[PDB]
Design a protein around this ligand. Structure first.
Ligand SMILES: Nc1ncnc2c1ncn2[C@@H]1O[C@H](COP(=O)(O)OP(=O)(O)OP(=O)(O)O)[C@@H](O)[C@H]1O
Ligand SMILES: Nc1ncnc2c1ncn2[C@@H]1O[C@H](COP(=O)(O)OP(=O)(O)OP(=O)(O)O)[C@@H](O)[C@H]1O
Ligand SMILES: Nc1ncnc2c1ncn2[C@@H]1O[C@H](COP(=O)(O)OP(=O)(O)OP(=O)(O)O)[C@@H](O)[C@H]1O
Lengths: 506, 512, 514
């Protein structure tokens, strides 16, 4: 009942690498994933794969828990962890079959990890010029939106560029929470735009198109028949007693909307449905009524202006209301939306509205937009850029093998295997593009031998050659490559450190 | 269903041999441990033979009779229970005379009961008198059980506890010298303190705590009162119940409850007492009229514990609370005290004499240490009881077994008849006690047992025993491995009384 | 069935089975084990105590050895998985002579003879060095490097050495309850350090609060300033919703009269400039009461613990107060820098630079959940090893130098009870050499290569020899700074003789029925 007992901890992580190796790159394949609520979904993002695939082996859960740390401090390269650290554990199995101990590979990996953190600042070619221009920003964002939505990057690189420039004067406060995404059904991606302030997809149900009131109250309860918090035994016998309750319901709701006018609040948000007679009372006292059925659309407004959602039927409470500058309506893309604009304030809220005919298609654009904001959320720190497309993966594999050859002793075996694990990432890019991977690696090492740096893969099915990444405009993030190498090495050293797994009762 | 014939005569043999084979290797100071497997996965590694068979369920009627005859033997004397079940399994183990010779058991019982008379006659010939007045000779008897224990640090003080307890219970005026440790020497455990704090007082201690400061703290002349009736609401001759749910019933019951208790409490405070002792319980309202006279409330005492209080002070047991008189006085007692010991209150009615009763007060640093001394002292009290019952020792460690088996061989040469063949089998069955001592030591058993019989033939039979420490033969007059006579007298008597009971069974039938 | 010696052969296979499992996690070069709770809880440890107490085994005989390591940590706190590796080889080497016809009681009589000679040998190799800063680093280095992947082995030594040195003065006994262990997320694993003051879970939540107070008078409070019941003989009666608004103002007036009393005590005692005032109230505080105190410069803290309030009594010096009606200045304390530490999500109040707190809080930071529990079990094993070095001033050389020196001392030793006890000191000498044997397999070297070199090293002087974790050469433990405790090695030889006796002293196993 025991065969190897050290190989089964690695084979569980090799299956986790295979679910994202073919899904790597701009030529990567999509995944037909099934939601837990029985919903069909088509995506190719690496973070949405692990969220739905409930992996159960705890040896492969270390790389998944490393992906949750990969989502922190950087929003770039979750697929880089599942490919590179998967190639670390696959190449480490060739050393253990010879007779090498597992503790010798551990100290040899941490030696080559600190050596790879010194060669990576030497490969920084360009940097951002901090001009806050749409030509400088969209030139670097065109590589990050690639490998998410290929072919439609010409419309996505300009829209997120117009959102992040409006936040860059607010220095030290740029984040992904300031740029929100609201999806509106429409024609396609060509009709999409970008707006300022908080934009919701639902229009104002009332007849007010513009109001300058600051007091905003949110009530999650729908507009229906009022129920007393006490017992409240209400009995009806005849038709005249039913009309006394029907007219008395409208008369009490007339005093309910009058309490909103007494506190000086002309903006009300209702989570549930609104009755037709209660909608007439809101338009009488010039009150803007916006219906928001989504709970995440209601929770977004409490964390911005402070207006809380109360369960009671319109309570006149002055303490739990929010504050905004100007709430109005705007007609963009043949659809009226509500804008929570900040006129007196300088403003740091931007909303990118996305249009599309398929909800399964518009959700993949939302993961491509939030990964585009997270590329420049990293660039609020020290600006360093590295060439992409497998350009840095060969030069880092060239210097480590040159370093491990000159170093004598038993530690030269784990350093040489640390460089060949970087070769799997151009092997993942060449295989997904329909090109023989053994020819591109030989074409990459032949041009890097002569000193022609910044050379990556030519993205073409018919051309197995290479091209320059500096003239092509392909650039990655150095901090995106810095935390990816450190977290994948710390994850792959954790799986090799654990030998056997024993179940225990609580 | 049912079984009769010669199969139950062999079926009861293997039922007793299976019990004897379990605890055969648990004899002597080198007793091997035994591992018990629980259904919940628990494991106890106790080597005590009384603890092994208690936690093992049996299904045979002969094997069930084997455990209870040693359990009653454990209540009589506190030592020698393992040697009973070993000897009872060895006497029935030679089944060649029971089945192959086609002998009726009546021939065997006539040979076994005739060999029982040679058990008592041989042990009185190898005996030795004991100078019980010297305390140094009493220390060399009880020390065989104090070794490898946590009480062994205080062996000079723990030996004074058990020796003073057995002498107060033993009454030389009655002639038969009765000792009963369960009643007149009731041991109680008190947490707190150390092992050196534990001493012996001449009285009875009450473990009831003090709930109110309006009590007697220090009284030089304690006026004690004993009562059997209850102190509660008056019940009738029927079996009706008391349920208070209405406000009209709450007033009528409590007015009858107060008027009867005040009528009862007026009869006891007219004699000006110091502590009240009732057999049944005392209600909460009964202490309200009792605290005005500053009397210590003691309740919930058994009838067996009540006579120890009456023999301590000299009071009169009064059945009803309306029938108190002036003769119910406790004149002559030492002191009444409710002083706390380690934040527990204890009542003292001790005296400076021997009022046919005593108690043992134990102290220790933790409650596990309290349970360690009480299981060692009670094992030590029953061994020293048998010395004061009859001041005679026997050479233990297998020396008495080879001396008895040597006398049976020369007696069998003059015993004619058919019964001489099972008569010689008892002599070889009594050799199993020095046989397992050499096997537990690890030496060669047959090489040592053959030279053991050669020393018992030519030399004196009172010497040349077995030492269960080194594995060789030593003289029993040099080392203190002496066993009491009354333990070895009841050991061979019970092993015959077990063999006379299992061999006489010839049918096992069912029926309720 | 099977009324024979087969009850001993099944128990030694559980000892050989538990030896081959726990041999891969000794020393820093060893591997780790995973503890899956079945629901999803993942924990990585090398500690043999949690590997036997928390880990559940199916064998009943191996469950007894799990109860051995639970008794090991109560007296020493170290050497639980080293307890298993000796008794695994003790019952393995016993089987070479039991199958030849020897009784197990004879080998038990030889094991107690080898225990008294090895305990006398421990008195000669011990070094009574004066306890200072440098020698406690080497003791902390031998303990903390076996729970760390060698990136926190340098930072965690000065956190545990300076903590126990700050509480070791005036010949007082070391108390581990003076050390408070706190855990916080959203930080790196190397960001851990020592804190002079305490760490409170909930701080002041008000925009008008002071971010740092350099000097303040701390008033100990335990009064609930929230919506409480009536202290005067009254009741809760109301006719409508408007009567509740009158009742809530008649009920809360019992609260704000006490809040303004703290301002009157602040202005009376040290009401001038260059002063401060912190409230350490454990119970809940009214949010309206937070605006009343923050305008005059009072930082109010709420939602504290019961054990933290006793540490606040020793830090500041204020007596625990139960009612605000008898406020008096003797319940006031003093502290230095009282500021708030900002995290990514929460904020924590730090009250360091105290007068005489007699309590040091260790601040352990970690990015993951299972990373926090690993260092928390590492700091408790590391602090108990240095506590064994201060109370017991004599230390022993590490790296298995004692066990190789005890193997030569037990060879040149004749038994004085019998001649058949010669195998008792023979098997005890071979089973003690499993620690240089298992340190070769975890380091990746040959087992018999470094065993020859560690045994051939002899001289005409006092010299100790140990194994090398890097090169496999003979290495002196005194020259590199590898040291263990004398109290741990004294309990190691004492507990190994007892447990290997009880497995050797069984002959039959029976199914009990409660
Ligand atoms: N068109 C391209 N040209 C050059 N390099 C590319 C191209 N597409 C992807 N890459 C390379 O792929 C790696 C990142 O690719 P990818 O966009 O798949 O990661 P990602 O999907 O952003 O990670 P995450 O799953 O966290 O979003 C980089 O090393 C980059 O050099
Ligand atoms: N060193 C020794 N060598 C040989 N025999 C000894 C030695 N020490 C004591 N004995 C004998 O062993 C006897 C104890 O045997 P065993 O364990 O079978 O009975 P026990 O369990 O003590 O009886 P009980 O259950 O009534 O206490 C003692 O009566 C004593 O005479
Ligand atoms: N740097 C080192 N080089 C060589 N040997 C070492 C080193 N550090 C410690 N050791 C040895 O490792 C042994 C302790 O091993 P380890 O710390 O893995 O178990 P442990 O935690 O002591 O077990 P337990 O938790 O049961 O106390 C010590 O006896 C010591 O001799």
């Amino acid at each position: 009942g025991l065969e190897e007992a050290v190989y089964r901890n690695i084979q569980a992580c090799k299956e986790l690498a295979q679910t994202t190796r073919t899904a790597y790159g701009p030529n990567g394949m999509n995944k037909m994933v099934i939601n837990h609520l029985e919903k069909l979904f088509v995506t190719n993002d690496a973070a949405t794969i692990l969220r739905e695939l409930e992996v159960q082996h705890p040896a492969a859960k270390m790389i998944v828990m490393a992906s949750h740390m990969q989502e922190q401090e950087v929003g770039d390269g979750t697929n880089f962890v599942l490919v590179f650290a998967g190639a670390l554990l696959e190449l480490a199995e060739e050393l253990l079959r010879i007779g090498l101990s597992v503790s010798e590979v551990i100290e040899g990996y941490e030696i080559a990890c600190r050596k790879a953190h010194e060669i990576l600042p030497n490969l920084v070619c360009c940097s951002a010029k901090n001009l806050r221009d749409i030509d400088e920003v969209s030139s670097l964002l065109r590589t990050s939106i690639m490998s998410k939505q290929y072919g439609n990057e010409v419309f996505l690189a300009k829209l997120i560029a117009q959102a992040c420039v409006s936040i860059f004067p607010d220095s030290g406060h740029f984040n992904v929470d300031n740029i929100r995404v609201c999806k509106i059904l429409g024609s396609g991606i060509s009709s999409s735009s970008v707006l300022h302030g908080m934009v919701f997809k639902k229009e104002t149900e009332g007849d007010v198109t513009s109001v300058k009131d600051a007091k905003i109250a949110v009530y999650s309860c729908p507009f229906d028949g009022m129920i007393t918090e006490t017992k409240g035994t209400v009995l009806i016998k005849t038709a005249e007693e039913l009309m006394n309750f029907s007219k008395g319901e409208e008369n009490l709701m007339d005093a309910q909307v009058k309490a909103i006018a007494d506190t000086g609040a002309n903006v009300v948000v209702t989570g549930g449905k609104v009755a037709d007679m209660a909608l007439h009372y809101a338009n009488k006292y010039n009150i803007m009524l916006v219906r928001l059925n989504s709970k995440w659309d209601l929770r977004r407004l409490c964390k911005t202006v402070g207006a809380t959602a109360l369960p009671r039927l319109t309570p006149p409470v002055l303490e739990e209301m929010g504050h905004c500058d100007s709430v109005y309506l705007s007609e963009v893309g043949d659809t009226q939306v509500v804008v929570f604009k900040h006129e007196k304030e300088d403003g740091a809220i931007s909303t990118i509205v996305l249009r599309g005919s398929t909800d399964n298609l518009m959700d993949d654009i939302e993961r491509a937009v939030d990964d585009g904001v997270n590329t420049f959320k990293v660039l609020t720190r020290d600006k360093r850029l590295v060439p992409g497309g497998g350009a840095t993966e060969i030069e880092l594999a060239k210097q480590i093998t040159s370093y491990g050859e000159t170093c004598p002793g038993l530690e030269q075996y784990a350093i040489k295997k640390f460089a060949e694990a970087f070769e799997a990432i151009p092997r993942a890019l060449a295989e997904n593009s329909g090109v023989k991977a053994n020819e591109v690696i030989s074409k990459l090492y032949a041009v890097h031998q002569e000193g022609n740096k910044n050379v990556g893969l030519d993205i073409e099915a018919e051309v197995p050659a290479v091209k320059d990444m500096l003239e092509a405009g392909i650039l990655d993030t150095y901090l995106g490559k810095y935390w990816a190498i450190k977290l994948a090495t710390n994850a792959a050293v954790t799986v090799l450190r654990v030998d056997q797994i024993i179940m225990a009762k609580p | 269903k049912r079984e009769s014939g010669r199969k139950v005569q062999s079926g009861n043999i293997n039922a007793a041999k299976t019990i004897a084979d379990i605890i055969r290797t648990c004899l002597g100071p080198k007793s091997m441990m035994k591992m018990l497997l629980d259904p919940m996965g628990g494991i106890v590694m106790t080597n005590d033979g009384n603890a092994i068979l208690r936690e093992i369920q049996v299904q045979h009627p002969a094997a069930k009779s084997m455990i209870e005859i040693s359990r009653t033997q454990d209540e009589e004397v506190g030592d020698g229970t393992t040697s009973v079940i070993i000897l009872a399994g060895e006497m029935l183990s030679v089944a060649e005379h029971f089945l192959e010779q086609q002998m009726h058991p009546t021939v065997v019982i006539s040979a076994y009961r005739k060999a029982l008379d040679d058990m008592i006659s041989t042990l009185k010939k190898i005996s030795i008198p004991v100078d019980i007045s010297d305390s140094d000779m009493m220390l060399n008897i009880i020390n065989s059980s104090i070794t490898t224990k946590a009480i062994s640090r205080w062996s000079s003080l723990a030996c004074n506890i058990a020796l003073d307890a057995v002498k107060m219970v033993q009454f030389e005026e009655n002639g038969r010298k009765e000792i009963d440790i369960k009643k007149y020497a009731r041991v109680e455990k008190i947490p707190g303190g150390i092992i050196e704090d534990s001493c012996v007082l001449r009285g009875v201690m009450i473990n009831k705590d003090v709930t109110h400061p309006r009590m007697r703290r220090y009284i030089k002349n304690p006026r004690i009162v004993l009562l059997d009736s209850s102190l509660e609401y008056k019940k009738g001759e029927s079996q009706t119940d008391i349920e208070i749910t209405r406000e009209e019933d709450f007033t009528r019951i409590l007015q009858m409850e107060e008027e009867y208790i005040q009528q009862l409490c007026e009869d006891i405070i007219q004699l000006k007492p110091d502590v009240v002792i009732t057999e049944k319980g005392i209600s909460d309202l009964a202490q309200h009229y009792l605290m005005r006279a500053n009397i210590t409330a003691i309740r919930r005492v058994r009838k067996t514990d009540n006579n120890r209080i009456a023999r301590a002070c000299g009071a009169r047991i009064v059945s009803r609370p309306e029938e108190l008189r002036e003769d119910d006085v406790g004149t002559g007692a030492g002191l009444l005290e409710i002083k706390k010991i380690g934040d527990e209150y204890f009542t003292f009615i001790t005296d400076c004499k021997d009022p046919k009763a005593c108690t043992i007060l134990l102290r220790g640093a933790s409650k596990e240490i309290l349970s360690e001394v009480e299981r060692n002292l009670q094992d030590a009290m029953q061994v020293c009881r048998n010395v004061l019952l009859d001041p005679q020792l026997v050479p233990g460690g297998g020396a008495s077994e080879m001396a008895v088996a040597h006398a049976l061989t020369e007696k069998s040469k003059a015993m004619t008849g058919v019964e001489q063949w099972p008569y010689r089998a008892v002599a070889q069955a009594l050799e199993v006690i020095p046989r397992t001592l050499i096997q537990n030591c690890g030496a060669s058993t047959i090489r040592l047992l053959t030279s053991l019989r050669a020393k018992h033939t030519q030399e004196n039979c009172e010497t040349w025993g077995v030492n269960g420490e080194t594995g060789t033969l030593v003289d029993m007059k040099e080392l203190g491995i002496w066993e009491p006579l009354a333990v070895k007298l009841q050991t061979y008597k019970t092993a015959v009384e077990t063999a006379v009971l299992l061999l006489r069974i010839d049918d096992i039938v069912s029926g309720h | 069935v099977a009324r024979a010696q087969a009850a001993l052969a099944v128990n030694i296979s559980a000892a050989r089975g538990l030896q081959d499992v726990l041999r891969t996690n000794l020393g820093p070069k060893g591997t780790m084990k995973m503890l899956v709770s079945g629901a999803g809880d993942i924990k990585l440890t090398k500690d043999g105590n949690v590997l036997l107490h928390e880990m559940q085994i199916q064998h009943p005989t191996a469950s007894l050895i799990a109860k051995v390591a639970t008794a090991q940590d109560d007296i020493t706190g170290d050497g639980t998985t080293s307890n298993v590796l000796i008794i695994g080889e003790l019952l393995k080497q016993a089987d070479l002579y039991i199958s030849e016809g020897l009784h197990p009681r004879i080998i038990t009589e030889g094991f107690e003879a080898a225990k008294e000679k090895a305990l006398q040998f421990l008195e000669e190799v011990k070094v009574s060095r004066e306890m200072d800063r440098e020698t406690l680093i080497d003791v902390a280095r031998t303990s903390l490097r076996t729970k760390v992947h060698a990136e926190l082995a340098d930072v965690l030594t000065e956190a545990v050495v300076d903590s126990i040195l700050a509480i070791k003065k005036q010949d007082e006994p070391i108390d581990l309850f003076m050390i408070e262990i706190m855990e916080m997320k959203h930080k790196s694993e190397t960001d851990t350090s020592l804190i002079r003051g305490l760490v409170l879970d909930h701080g002041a939540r008000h925009p008008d609060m002071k971010k740092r107070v350099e000097d303040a008078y701390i008033l100990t409070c335990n009064v609930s300033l929230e919506y409480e019941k009536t202290e005067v003989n009254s009741g809760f009666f109301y006719k409508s919703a408007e009567e509740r608004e009158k009742l809530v103002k008649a009920e809360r007036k019992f609260i704000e009269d006490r809040v303004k009393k703290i301002i009157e005590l602040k202005r009376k005692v040290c009401g001038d400039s260059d002063k401060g005032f912190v409230v350490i109230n454990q119970k809940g505080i009214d949010p309206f009461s937070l605006d009343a105190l923050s305008k005059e410069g009072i930082v109010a803290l709420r939602r504290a613990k019961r054990r933290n309030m006793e540490r606040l009594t020793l830090a500041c010096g204020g007596v625990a107060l139960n009612s605000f009606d008898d406020l008096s200045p003797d319940c006031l304390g003093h502290a230095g820098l009282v500021y708030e530490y900002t995290l990514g999500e929460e904020k924590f109040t730090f009250i360091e630079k105290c007068n005489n707190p007699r309590s040091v809080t260790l601040l352990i930071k970690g990015p993951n959940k299972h990373t926090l529990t690993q260092i928390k079990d590492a700091v408790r094993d590391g602090l108990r090893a240095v506590k064994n070095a201060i109370d017991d001033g004599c230390v022993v050389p590490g790296a298995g130098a004692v066990e190789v020196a005890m193997a030569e001392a037990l060879i040149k030793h004749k038994p004085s009870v019998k001649g058949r006890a010669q195998l008792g000191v023979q098997a005890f000498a071979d089973a003690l050499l499993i620690i240089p044997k298992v340190l070769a397999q975890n380091s990746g070297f040959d087992l018999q290569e470094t065993l020859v070199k560690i045994q051939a090293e002899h001289s005409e002087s006092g010299q100790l020899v140990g194994v090398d974790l890097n090169t496999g050469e003979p290495m002196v433990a005194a020259e590199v700074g590898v040291w263990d405790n004398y109290c741990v090695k004294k309990q190691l030889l004492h507990s190994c003789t007892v447990i290997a006796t009880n497995i050797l002293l069984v002959d039959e196993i029976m199914r009990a029925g409660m």
